[PDB]
Amino acid sequence: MDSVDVVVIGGGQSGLSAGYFLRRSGLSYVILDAEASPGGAWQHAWHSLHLFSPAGWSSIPGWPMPASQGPYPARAEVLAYLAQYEQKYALPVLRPIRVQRVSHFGERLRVVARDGRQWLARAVISATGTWGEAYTPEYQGLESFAGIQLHSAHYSTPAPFAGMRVAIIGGGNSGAQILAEVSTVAETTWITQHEPAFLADDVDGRVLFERDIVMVPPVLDARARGVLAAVPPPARFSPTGMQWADGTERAFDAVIWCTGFRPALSHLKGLDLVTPQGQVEVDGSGLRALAVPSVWLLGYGDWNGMASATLIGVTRYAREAVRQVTAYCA
Amino acid sequence: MDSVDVVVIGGGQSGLSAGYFLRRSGLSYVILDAEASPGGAWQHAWHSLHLFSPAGWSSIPGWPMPASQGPYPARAEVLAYLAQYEQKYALPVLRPIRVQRVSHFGERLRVVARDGRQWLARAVISATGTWGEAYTPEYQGLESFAGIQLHSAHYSTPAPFAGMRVAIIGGGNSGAQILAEVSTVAETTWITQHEPAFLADDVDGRVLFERDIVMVPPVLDARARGVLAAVPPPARFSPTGMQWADGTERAFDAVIWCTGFRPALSHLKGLDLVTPQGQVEVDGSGLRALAVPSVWLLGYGDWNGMASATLIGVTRYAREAVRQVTAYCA
Ligand SMILES: Cc1cc2nc3c(=O)[nH]c(=O)nc-3n(C[C@@H](O)[C@H](O)[C@H](O)COP(=O)(O)OP(=O)(O)OC[C@@H]3O[C@@H](n4cnc5c(N)ncnc54)[C@H](O)[C@H]3O)c2cc1C
Numbered sequence: 001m002d003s004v005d006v007v008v009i010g011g012g013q014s015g016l017s018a019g020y021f022l023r024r025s026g027l028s029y030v031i032l033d034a035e036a037s038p039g040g041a042w043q044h045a046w047h048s049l050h051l052f053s054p055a056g057w058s059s060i061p062g063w064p065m066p067a068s069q070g071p072y073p074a075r076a077e078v079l080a081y082l083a084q085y086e087q088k089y090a091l092p093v094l095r096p097i098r099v100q101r102v103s104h105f106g107e108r109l110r111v112v113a114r115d116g117r118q119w120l121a122r123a124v125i126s127a128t129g130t131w132g133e134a135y136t137p138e139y140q141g142l143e144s145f146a147g148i149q150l151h152s153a154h155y156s157t158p159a160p161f162a163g164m165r166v167a168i169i170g171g172g173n174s175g176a177q178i179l180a181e182v183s184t185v186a187e188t189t190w191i192t193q194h195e196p197a198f199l200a201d202d203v204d205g206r207v208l209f210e211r212d213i214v215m216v217p218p219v220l221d222a223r224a225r226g227v228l229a230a231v232p233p234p235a236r237f238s239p240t241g242m243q244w245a246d247g248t249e250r251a252f253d254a255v256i257w258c259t260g261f262r263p264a265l266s267h268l269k270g271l272d273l274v275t276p277q278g279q280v281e282v283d284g285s286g287l288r289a290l291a292v293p294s295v296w297l298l299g300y301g302d303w304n305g306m307a308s309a310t311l312i313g314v315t316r317y318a319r320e321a322v323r324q325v326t327a328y329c330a
Numbered sequence: 331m332d333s334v335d336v337v338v339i340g341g342g343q344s345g346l347s348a349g350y351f352l353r354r355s356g357l358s359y360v361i362l363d364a365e366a367s368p369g370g371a372w373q374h375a376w377h378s379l380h381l382f383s384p385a386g387w388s389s390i391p392g393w394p395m396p397a398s399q400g401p402y403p404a405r406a407e408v409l410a411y412l413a414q415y416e417q418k419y420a421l422p423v424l425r426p427i428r429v430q431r432v433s434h435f436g437e438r439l440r441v442v443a444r445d446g447r448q449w450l451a452r453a454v455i456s457a458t459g460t461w462g463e464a465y466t467p468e469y470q471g472l473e474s475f476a477g478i479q480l481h482s483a484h485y486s487t488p489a490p491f492a493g494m495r496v497a498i499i500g501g502g503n504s505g506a507q508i509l510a511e512v513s514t515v516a517e518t519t520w521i522t523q524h525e526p527a528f529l530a531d532d533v534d535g536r537v538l539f540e541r542d543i544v545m546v547p548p549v550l551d552a553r554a555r556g557v558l559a560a561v562p563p564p565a566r567f568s569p570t571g572m573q574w575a576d577g578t579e580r581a582f583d584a585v586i587w588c589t590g591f592r593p594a595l596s597h598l599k600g601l602d603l604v605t606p607q608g609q610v611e612v613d614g615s616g617l618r619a620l621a622v623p624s625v626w627l628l629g630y631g632d633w634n635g636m637a638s639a640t641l642i643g644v645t646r647y648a649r650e651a652v653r654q655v656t657a658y659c660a
């Protein structure tokens with residue numbers, strides 16, 4: 001039981017941002033990350049992933065992302081930037097540490113690791129991202145589908161789907177991007193709930209910040225190859241594929257689920273903080289939990305801050321959260 | 331679809347060992363392993379772990395463990411041995427791969443990975459170990475225990491336990507060794523289903539191969555500090571500890587469950603192969619499945635060969651299982 005003013009749970013860009021401001025405050029604190037290496041959920045994105053904005057529009061507080069040389073920074077660059085960032089600021093990051101549980105300890109909070117290490121914190125900033133909680137919807141007959149199934153979370157490479165009939169389900173950025181790539185080797189069907197919405201060709205992801213899906217080069221190359229049409233969801237799944245309410249069938253060898261994530265919040269279960277919808281109720285700042293005021297949330301998505309779940313978006317909230325925690329411990 | 335005669339699932343000692351024999355046979359095969367590195371489950375063991383036998387009693391088929399300089403090999407040396415081993419025999423090991431499921435595909439076996447990679451196999455050898463299914467029993471009152479719990483699986487170091495009252499539950503080698511070490515910083519209580527059985531001070535784990543707990547140096551030291559005394563199981567747990575049958579109460583800050591493991595066979599689900607006891611129905615060999623004669627099982631433990639879940643004792647079964655698969659493919 002090291003006592004610290006603030007425990008930051010998660011050491012991705014979100015935790016790193018919190019850590020940038022906690023440095024500039026009086027407070028003692030620690031960043032606890034489960035990964036083997038720095039870079040957060042980026043270590044788990046497919047090989048070809050680039051960001052949808054230039055380096056300069058993908059920097060977190062203070063030291064900006066080094067200059068990269070394409071239009072858009074490669075996966076490896078985010079990784080490197082995140083790791084250099086930790087050093088530059090000598091951020092107190094402990095990794096690998098899986099936090100099992102945050103629980104009550106009087107006015108403070110006890111943070112417990114899978115291996116028995118413990119902190120006692122006046123405040124906790126939960127910054128554990130969404131990747132660990134990949135969401136797959138529930139469709140009739142799905143368990144009797146005989147082909148291949150993976151989430152976008154585990155998508156890596158197009159080679160495995162070569163020569164197949166593949167269904168890509170979900171119309172976010174992941175769908176459009178995975179569809180783009182996989183379709184260069186497989187017959188592809190894009191299955192989306194709503195007609196997929198595209199930003200203009202002459203604009204990138206920065207537009208989301210200044211405020212649906214970005215025309216990055218592979219996606220542009222896909223529109224040209226005539227592959228970006230969607231179909232609405234089937235009524236159910238058969239062993240060999242899907243069926244629509246109008247009777248229509250399609251066989252598929254594989255299905256790639258691009259149907260989103262939820263907050264990785266299993267470490268706050270039993271604090272009664274997690275809503276049914278996989279969130280937590282927050283005050284008007286969007287950052288401090290209603291039910292337990294010692295607990296802050298950072299980076300999760302719009303429900304937690306408009307555009308908080310992006311590299312450029314996170315900064316605002318990081319500063320805001322840390323100013324509220326700074327006041328709180330004085 | 332990559333076709334091979336044999337897919338070996340799992341790349342610890344057990345999978346390396348089958349690898350050795352499959353190399354000497356003429357079959358085409360591959361070894362799929364989930365970890366980030368070679369070394370199987372040794373990677374995930376506490377810092378102080380040493381083997382309970384000398385290098386030469388901890389060698390797998392063919393190339394013996396390099397000579398270690400203390401009485402027993404350090405964890406590091408096991409990792410280095412298994413790593414050097416794969417190199418020396420150029421074994422076809424792919425890592426990380428997580429095999430999600432095995433399925434009937436016509437004559438043969440489809441092996442599917444979390445990212446959609448797919449082998450096609452006439453024969454499968456499941457060598458996935460036990461570490462991934464840590465076992466913790468159910469105990470009345472437990473869900474209210476308000477202190478730290480963790481399994482021997484995630485035990486790292488003693489510092490987390492200094493000053494605590496700790497229960498160590500399980501009378502294997504894990505209980506004895508975790509107990510030895512933790513009681514140098516904590517007021518300890520060892521809780522065991524049966525009188526624990528010790529081998530003679532003047533002998534080591536080779537005696538389990540020649541057919542219970544080994545007097546390894548830390549354990550010897552523990553017996554002398556007068557801490558190797560078991561107590562029987564409690565009747566219930568409360569929020570602060572445990573209660574025994576005769577009403578006695580003992581408070582605890584932490585419990586370390588060293589209550590054993592089960593086979594890691596979630597990849598064999600939906601093949602009617604995994605028993606309610608978590609095992610597989612084997613033939614008189616102990617190796618070949620009844621329900622699917624094209625699945626062999628290797629390394630898991632007594633039910634799967636006598637001293638099969640040890641370094642020295644897997645070799646025999648390894649050779650045996652490859653013999654049966656060579657023949658099966660003819
Ligand atoms: C496919 C994909 C493409 C994207 N494209 C872009 C883009 O172009 N530009 C952009 O700005 N954003 C993009 N995003 C959104 C992006 O901002 C990421 O989601 C980013 O990873 C979120 O930052 P984070 O630090 O909150 O997430 P993470 O990187 O998930 O956060 C860090 C995580 O905390 C650790 N953790 C979780 N639980 C625990 C626990 N219980 N105990 C200890 N540690 C724990 C995780 O291991 C650690 O890595 C993309 C996201 C995805 C998924």
Ligand SMILES: Cc1cc2nc3c(=O)[nH]c(=O)nc-3n(C[C@@H](O)[C@H](O)[C@H](O)COP(=O)(O)OP(=O)(O)OC[C@@H]3O[C@@H](n4cnc5c(N)ncnc54)[C@H](O)[C@H]3O)c2cc1C
Nearest residue numbers: 340341342343344364370371381382429458459629640641
């Ligand atoms: C604390 C402890 C001390 C021990 N002491 C000794 C000792 O002193 N001497 C001795 O001889 N033995 C000892 N043992 C037994 C020992 O042999 C280990 O159990 C050893 O790890 C077993 O080797 P294995 O290759 O069968 O299992 P592992 O080493 O666990 O097996 C390898 C595993 O297969 C992979 N795998 C599992 N599922 C999948 C999947 N779906 N897809 C891909 N890969 C998968 C795992 O990631 C990979 O590492 C000890 C065990 C423990 C737990």
